[PDB]
Amino acid sequence: MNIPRFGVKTDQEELLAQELENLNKWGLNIFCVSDYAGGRSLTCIMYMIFQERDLLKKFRIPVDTMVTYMLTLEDHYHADVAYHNSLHAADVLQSTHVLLATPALDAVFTDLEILAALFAAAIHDVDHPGVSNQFLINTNSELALMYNDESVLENHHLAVGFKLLQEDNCDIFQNLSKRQRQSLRKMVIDMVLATDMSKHMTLLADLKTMVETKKVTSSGVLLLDNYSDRIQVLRNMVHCADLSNPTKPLELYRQWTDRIMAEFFQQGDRERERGMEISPMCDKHTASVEKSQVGFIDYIVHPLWETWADLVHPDAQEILDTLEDNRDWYYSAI
Ligand SMILES: CC(=O)CCCCn1c(=O)c2c(ncn2C)n(C)c1=O
Ligand SMILES: [Mg+2]
Ligand SMILES: [Zn+2]
């Protein structure tokens, strides 16, 4: 291919150039990006980010190969799924891109660790069917049997993300050294596996413990002396970016909330048809969208982002406020 300016073919190039000025900002509107990029946000944003960080040249990644992988990856997100489609992936990627550039983490991560995090973010939900792990377990699916009921979807996301590199002209890591490929794989595994919600408690516990014994340079920049600490920060970062929806401008968060409930209810419908015990928040006949988000933010999202903010202080101060404003907004919408 000839490679379009912003990676994708668009009829609204300038309206798109407008939004991409927010590429490095929390305030980026990915819904607009999707609209202006013919529904290919993940391909667009990943291309932009990779140019922005000079990652194509750094790792000697042919552009045509990069674009072919990204389109392939995007195609394996399900368009009929309400929330867990390529838009969610583009969102999580871009948030991750911002969280990497946060001042308190300046010159901490290697280029490889950066590359891994962005690759993990992009693939973390590929080929999601629109139902939870427990649904795949209860139905005795092939997937749940392969992976022994443990992080089924997440394991599936890793398998699919990596196997796609083998489709014609998709090997974006072809010029990486063996050592680097080995190392990237590990990091990506750890990060994607950390997006299983049942890992959240331990993840946050470790992050909290990290925060209490943190050491800083003269500048305010965090000092992560060794590898083990860094991947712990990377795991939490992608996890944060994954649950970053309620930290965004209210206009966006509400649209995310609508997408997730549609997905949730659609599972519930299917659970009902099959006479299965309905999963939490999936019963359209008894679910309070507004209560659920307040519980979610109170028990999961605030504790998570608070701890992250302590770690990167004071870089996340505005993000934390926005979460608290959004919490309040949903509290009063009951
Ligand atoms: C709007 C948004 O952030 C959806 C992505 C998170 C999905 N999600 C949950 O995972 C969840 C939840 N409550 C408990 N849990 C474990 N809610 C409300 C939720 O949306
Ligand atoms: Mg996931
Ligand atoms: Zn996700």
Number of helical segments with 4 or more residues: 16
Task: Output the helix-strand order.
Answer: HHHHHHHHHHHHHHHH
Overall number of domains? 1
N-C termini distance: 51 Å
**Strand pairing plus helix content: what structural class?**
mainly alpha
What structural keywords apply?
monomer, mainly alpha, 61% helix, binds 3,7-dimethyl-1-(5-oxohexyl)-3,7-dihydro-1H-purine-2,6-dione, binds magnesium ion
How is this structure best described in words?
This protein has helices at 13-19, 30-36, 41-52, 55-58, 63-75, 86-101, 111-123, 133-138, 142-146, 152-163, 178-193, 200-212, 227-242, 250-273, 289-312, 317-332. With 334 residues, it is mainly α. It has a single domain (1-334), classed as Catalytic domain of cyclic nucleotide phosphodiesterase 4b2b, CATH 1.10.1300. Helix 2 (30-36) crosses helix 3, helix 3 packs parallel to helix 6 (86-101) and helix 11 (178-193) packs across helix 13 (227-242). The chain binds 3,7-dimethyl-1-(5-oxohexyl)-3,7-dihydro-1H-purine-2,6-dione, magnesium ion (MG) and zinc ion. Residues 124-125, 154, 195 line the site of magnesium ion. Residues 8-334 form the PDEase domain.
Concise synopsis of the structure shown:
With 334 residues, this protein is an all-alpha fold. The chain is built from 16 helices and no strands. Belongs to the cyclic nucleotide phosphodiesterase family. PDE4 subfamily.
